[PDB]
From Swiss-Prot, chains A, G:
Its EC number is 2.5.1.54. Keywords: Amino-acid biosynthesis, Aromatic amino acid biosynthesis, Cadmium, Cobalt, Manganese, Metal-binding, Transferase. Binds 1 divalent cation per subunit. The enzyme is active with manganese, cobalt or cadmium ions. GO terms for molecular function: 3-deoxy-7-phosphoheptulonate synthase activity; manganese ion binding. Feedback inhibited by tryptophan, tyrosine, phenylalanine and chorismate. Pathway: Metabolic intermediate biosynthesis; chorismate biosynthesis; chorismate from D-erythrose 4-phosphate and phosphoenolpyruvate: step 1/7. Belongs to the class-II DAHP synthase family. This is Phospho-2-dehydro-3-deoxyheptonate aldolase AroG. GO terms for biological process: amino acid biosynthetic process; aromatic amino acid family biosynthetic process; chorismate biosynthetic process; protein homooligomerization. InterPro entries: Aldolase_TIM, DAHP_synth_2. The gene is aroG. Homodimer. Interacts with Rv0948c. It comes from the Bacteria.
UniProtKB/Swiss-Prot annotation, chains B, H:
Homodimer. Interacts with AroG. Keywords: Amino-acid biosynthesis, Aromatic amino acid biosynthesis, Cytoplasm, Isomerase. The record marks R28 as: Important for catalysis. Residues 1-72 form the Chorismate mutase domain. Its EC number is 5.4.99.5. Pathway: Metabolic intermediate biosynthesis; prephenate biosynthesis; prephenate from chorismate: step 1/1. This is Intracellular chorismate mutase.
Curated annotation (Swiss-Prot), chains C, F:
Belongs to the class-II DAHP synthase family. The keyword Transferase applies. It comes from Mycobacterium tuberculosis (strain ATCC 25618 / H37Rv). Its cofactor is Mn(2+); Co(2+); Cd(2+). Feedback inhibited by tryptophan, tyrosine, phenylalanine and chorismate. SUPFAM superfamilies: Aldolase (SSF51569). Mn(2+) binds at C80, H362, E395. InterPro entries: Aldolase_TIM, DAHP_synth_2. This is Phospho-2-dehydro-3-deoxyheptonate aldolase AroG. Phosphoenolpyruvate binds at R119, E276, R277, K299, R330. Its EC number is 2.5.1.54. GO terms for molecular function: 3-deoxy-7-phosphoheptulonate synthase activity; manganese ion binding. GO terms for biological process: amino acid biosynthetic process; aromatic amino acid family biosynthetic process; chorismate biosynthetic process; protein homooligomerization. The gene is aroG.
């Protein structure tokens, strides 16, 4: 059983300025890989609804993130990006969102201690509802599942058809999630000492706990020292978790564009930051052109086929104003390749004079699974130490790694940061 | 005070374990494997738990001498 | 055009019994849609992310306790009715700004904190005295129930509007949270709007002295070393009339309450009130209010007796928790001075500490003068009894935004 | 002798302001006896506009005259 | 007709206050021409005491009359 | 009765050369005691704990830079002359209270921070125009030099008074620090004294509106969540006229200054000034001021020319450091409007940024009206030029405490 | 060569209230050990000067110390008391005072980290100018040196005579010192991370540094974590160092009495807290009677001749209102005796229901010297662990122990506090 | 991987050093001395500095097993 919810067809706000729309329209005339195959008129109808809904994020938050990412780029902070590999509407619930917020804050406190510098927390949340696929036919002979913004997971033909109403369903889920993320990060749950009590319960009940007990205890003593010196929860933070997803479905991202400033600029207000995946980063494609036109900080996934030359081209396209932290280059080479392939990319990019964030994705390129994940982050750190560059952050998927494992990874990366 | 002799011995054995541990790391990597392996570090730690709560600290210190500091 | 949606641990035994008993009582003013369709929609809402969280409701209760004790003032206001159509960022931003503007004026005049409660993120249902309106159509009952369009088809009660109401509510709340933690919620940026109002209003000369005094107070704060980062982030709470019990029961969640035991919280809002037409003492709405942990209000009109007011207090604040209950006086300007004092005296003699809040709209010589006269009479009642004039409840549509600002200036004077 | 005039000129202002406070109170009782409201917003703006000729300080004088006329708001 | 008197009573107040502002300025020029100071503290207290009969608001009226008379301090 | 006292790394070569050259210049108004006895006393003072520390002087310089740039106001005041006899806790506490009271009023009126500089912990020496007074006795030159008693023996210049001055100064400073970090320095406790003053003064009615407005501003701060713990601890700086060069040179200490290189700081005070009778352009006092890192002031009387004022600025602020130099105007009320503008214009055209401070006492129709008229004329001069009226320098004895408070209210009005 | 400085004979302030003076006069009729032998009329003259001088401390600071000592007594903070064994007028200089302030702050940051709770910092400063002596004739055949408030250190007859003018000389030195202590504790010197940089320089250059490097590094990482979490110097503290000395010369202490409050009370404003030494703690003596009448927190030195019964008598005399932290009992048994002698004292006092602070003085009762000092603090901790009572603080003398050693001691006590 | 045998040995020697170290502590205390002696802990630390910067950490851990935690 399903229920139909009428999409309230409501009055338009003023259009975006004609000049910015001309630029956007030129950008989106470029070919776009991995796009849903729904009819353009239905897509247009759904975009028109989304053009007037309240945004998920607001410009001042994106400007603030940019400033914090500038510090990461300059070697004075570390980026933690993490969360669900794929969000689903079915699991977009309070316990699931709370679990992810908790895990991110737990990772961040360990990483802050190890890094001795602030950690910017970016969730894969409130929009991670679309993925590419290598084949349009899966192992059951069905059209491939492309995420809940596009079609249904259920193994049947009707569910797998590309349904443009899922654009509006994605927005509703995204804004409801983000509302809860904001509520949670402003509560006492997000208190540093409450967050770390969970880390100590992890050490106490995990089979691998003895490996992390010394560091968990050291962190606890740091927090108690803070408190003994008169530092209260009352003053700190309050916790800031930013929203990100892969900018994949351009119908959604373009509908969520809003105007803000010194000059008028388009911000993508579906998220704070977005990235462009390995299969949609064509240099002359629509995704890269779109990232070019928006003010948001952006990331590009770089795999083993990456050349240092193409990497410099992303820098020149995506950071033309030389704004530190505006562009993040996300390495996902595989633990066996990262030590060979990343260094010449890093050297060439560093010689441009631009300040990107170097972030490690140890999942997408990868004896045992966890050991390979850890080995790629290790290899990533080794490359940056040798080159004198900043190992700027990690990008991890929780499902891949479960929550307990991602927490272990934070402890091991904390040790690497020392 | 037997006991500087006992320290002279454990020093020698600790130095040797570092040599052997590095040799294992070069072997696994030369054969296409990862320097660190999580399940083996848990085994070294479980081995020393007879010393009490300080066992794991000794274990982790022996791992540090063997496979170096993480991130370097 | 439609979106398609394809359709949990048990309550403690006592909470289930009490919730069931409350909802079995007669409920006035409910939509007349089919129970099976209602159940499908409630089932969807039972698993969605909440609009608010318990820790915020407990914090509101603490802040409202200060109002009840005479140490803070309650400002409640916003749209008379939110509509899906106007649930837009410019509209939401305008309401947040107006409430913040009114709050800064009222804080200065009260010389004490102001608790800010918006009619927002849920104010989608209204009661009607008649089911057939002046056009011969079934009455518009708000967007949670039916459509405003003057045609029969649009006026049919549509249970899918429960889910639409939630989507609209959570989207608005998300933005309210974003806006209140942005730099535009800064007190000095907020009062620059009040100063623009004084410059451009035709009545501005009446308020300029007070707006200038406030500005000098702000600049003084800053000259003493107070920065925006040093202040508490602006807090706007969400409220609406708890009218549609299908919606409120679907948004119930279990959490540990202020005394540590598991309690039911209505997570559709921080606080809700029960209106004149649904406050039957043995009805579902009052019984429902008795089972939830949220702070609540009850509207009291000109037929209220001191004895019935005490009964509401004893049923709704049985543990004598200051701030849990607000009594919202709406008597009309010609009646408040005569009818409110006996109610206040009887309630005060119980030892319970309610918030006395003035709703100068619904009981009401030009219209603005009547609205101001009721609030004036409300302050006189409390001054004479030695009790606390605790707050105001205003609606913007009739009072427009400029008038609601003028009223804040006038009430700030009364608070002196 | 100019100082001597200001003394007289102040005695006359004081007398008229006292009289205005009485006449204003009297209009108040009369409007309330007839079922009207003590304060009337449009009338307060008329008094303020009436003293605008004094400059920026004119509106402050007006509001002071209204306070002597009705009383403090909330009291 | 009481409303009609307040209209006249306000016209007369406005006229006398305008006149007091002129006569006050004139005493100012005269004292300064003779080598004296614009402001004289003892005289301001005399004006304030003179309006005390109006109650608490009397001193505010006085200070307003002094502001129309001399001007803003520091200007 | 006497206490008995039984009698260091070298300065950088350049600082020794410069210090020696400054002190070899002619010094006006110096005590006439024997050099050997002076040397013994300076030797004692060279090893004592300082009255102030360099980090505080550097912080004062930063805060004074804000005054010079038009973003803060300088309040300087306290005893005309401190005496050993009245160096008691009640007297010191009274002065701290009065300065804090004046500072809160002036902050509100200025709508910007007020820097508070007391004449305290060292104001023990004064110049005299005549060496024989009206009783035929050698003139009393303050307790650092001789005694106030009208007899010849008490008027002899006594170098032991250098050590007594230090003991008195450090004891007073200790208490000033204790008092300014106590709860009584809280803004709201401080302004309760202003409100008592308004209640009990015969002139109170003149100031009540402003005192009430200030109180409402304070209560507003508090209603917005600002607590005393959240504010900056009250900072009162120590100053006196740098008159007796034996004392000032003995209190010099070497420390790294704002640019990192070793500098000489006079640690007898945070800031010092040079008076009308000792400001000879090629004399020891000006040359001494050129060698110390402290912020300094120079008194400018009615014979000051625009050209000499520029010369002081170029000698005393050679690196163009805003706030390093204060020019203290004391022209008399009848002369300030005519004599100050040409001085201000010429100095402003140099590109240097001095603090313009009004001393309405020493150039001066009742006495209070003259004092107020000079400050009034000072504000008019600056309003006309578009320059910053930067501060006031007042003395309590003649102006009493109640009058100094009234003057703060009147200057707060001028600052609006 | 000396210089005579005339004592300005200045006007009196109002006398203390007649009722409090009657109580004080009754107290001071009791016999007082170890008092200077100067003439009563000269003493009276000097006291009269001191009765009208500005105080060294103020009542609100003493009330605040009391509140902080109440937390120590309740097991929620730790007391660090330390400084010069004896202050001299000759060494009462900026470098010497700064050195002591620095050392105390250095010790306190290490101890806070180890304790995981606030540390109250009490200097032996601004008044520690008098000591008792066992014999009135020293090894040179001269009258014994009793400290600079009483006589001169110089080995000659004239210097050794008891000189009542030294009461006023002591005050001048005390107030000048306290002025500098206040200035220093309000500067950036007192910043936690600046203070600990000195600790790291200690580890780096001390021959015993390797013993303390792990803990110094751990503390550094705690501070950097604080800073990374957004905690600035701007908000913390500012540092509070309290003044103490042995209340020995009753002419000085009585002259420094001032009135404050709910009832009128005498505060000794020569210090924040004072103690009564082993040789002047006669239960029916003037020193204990004086401590009875003043509002200040007080301490009593307890040596190896102490009985549990006499210790309860001090509790009943000196804490009659049962105010936690008002009374500190300072153990100085010797490392060889502390484990045997302290426990029955602690048990009996604990059974009274009063809440004293238990503080260890490991100096005055004591193979090698440093090992004995450490062993007594160790023994002290062992006694409290076994009894379940709070090891409340330490009282150390810097000269005994040099500065480097006292810092080492803080690291070792920090480890004991874990 | 010799190497679990090497760990089995150093474990045995570490356990024995704890036995001997306690026996020295009882001996010194029975003869009227202090449990801890600072100069001896510096000697144990200087002994292990050949292992590098982790030497002192091992040394201090061996002291902990021998003479227990400070304060307990």
């Amino acid at each position: 059983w399903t229920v139909d919810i009428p999409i309230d067809q409501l009055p338009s706000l003023p259009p975006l300025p004609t000049d910015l729309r001309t630029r956007l329209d030129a950008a989106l005339a470029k070919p776009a890989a991995q796009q849903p195959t729904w009819p353009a008129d239905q897509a247009l109808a759904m975009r028109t609804v989304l053009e007037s809904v309240p945004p998920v994020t607001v410009p001042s938050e994106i400007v603030r993130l940019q400033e914090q990412l500038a510090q990461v780029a300059k070697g004075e902070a570390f980026l933690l990006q993490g969360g669900d590999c794929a969000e689903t509407f079915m699991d977009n619930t309070e316990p699931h969102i709370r679990g992810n917020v908790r895990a991110l804050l737990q990772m961040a406190v360990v990483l802050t201690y190890g890094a001795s510098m602030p950690v910017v927390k970016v969730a894969r949340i409130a929009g991670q509802y679309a993925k590419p696929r290598s084949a349009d036919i899966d192992a059951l002979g069905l059209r491939s599942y492309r995420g809940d913004m596009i079609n249904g997971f259920a193994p049947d033909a009707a569910a797998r058809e590309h349904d443009p109403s899922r654009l509006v369903r994605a927005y509703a889920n995204a804004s409801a999630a983000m509302n809860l993320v904001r509520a949670l990060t402003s509560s006492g749950l997000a208190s540093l000492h409450l967050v770390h009590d969970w880390n100590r319960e992890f050490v106490r009940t995990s089979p691998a706990g003895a490996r992390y007990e010394a560091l968990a205890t050291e962190i606890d003593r740091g927090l108690r020292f803070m408190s003994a010196c008169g530092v209260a929860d009352r003053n700190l933070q309050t916790a800031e978790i930013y929203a990100s997803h892969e900018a994949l479905v351009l119908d959604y991202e373009r509908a969520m564009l809003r105007l803000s400033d010194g000059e008028p600029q388009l911000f993508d207000l579906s998220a704070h930051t977005v990235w462009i995946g390995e299969r949609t980063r064509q240099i002359d494609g629509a995704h890269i052109a779109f990232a070019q036109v928006i003010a948001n900080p952006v990331g590009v996934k770089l795999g083993p086929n990456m050349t240092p030359e193409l990497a410099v081209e992303y820098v020149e396209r995506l950071d033309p104003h030389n704004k530190p932290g505006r562009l993040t280059l996300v390495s996902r080479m595989g633990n066996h390749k990262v030590r060979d392939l990343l260094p010449p990319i890093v050297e060439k990019v560093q010689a441009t004079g631009h300040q990107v964030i170097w972030q490690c994705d140890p999942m997408h390129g990868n004896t045992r699974h966890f050991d390979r994940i850890v080995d790629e982050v290790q290899g990533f750190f080794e490359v940056h130490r040798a080159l004198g560059t900043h190992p700027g952050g990690i990008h991890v998927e929780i499902t891949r790694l479960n929550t307990q494992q991602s927490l272990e990874l934070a402890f091991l990366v904390a040790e690497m940061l020392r | 005070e037997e006991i500087d002799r006992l320290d002279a011995e454990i020093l020698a054995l600790v130095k040797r374990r570092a040599e052997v541990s590095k040799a294992i790391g070069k072997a696994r990597m030369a054969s296409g494997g990862t320097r660190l392996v999580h399940s083996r570090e848990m085994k070294v730690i479980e081995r020393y738990s007879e010393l009490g709560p300080d066992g794991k600290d000794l274990a982790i210190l022996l791992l540090r001498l063997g496979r170096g500091r993480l991130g370097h």
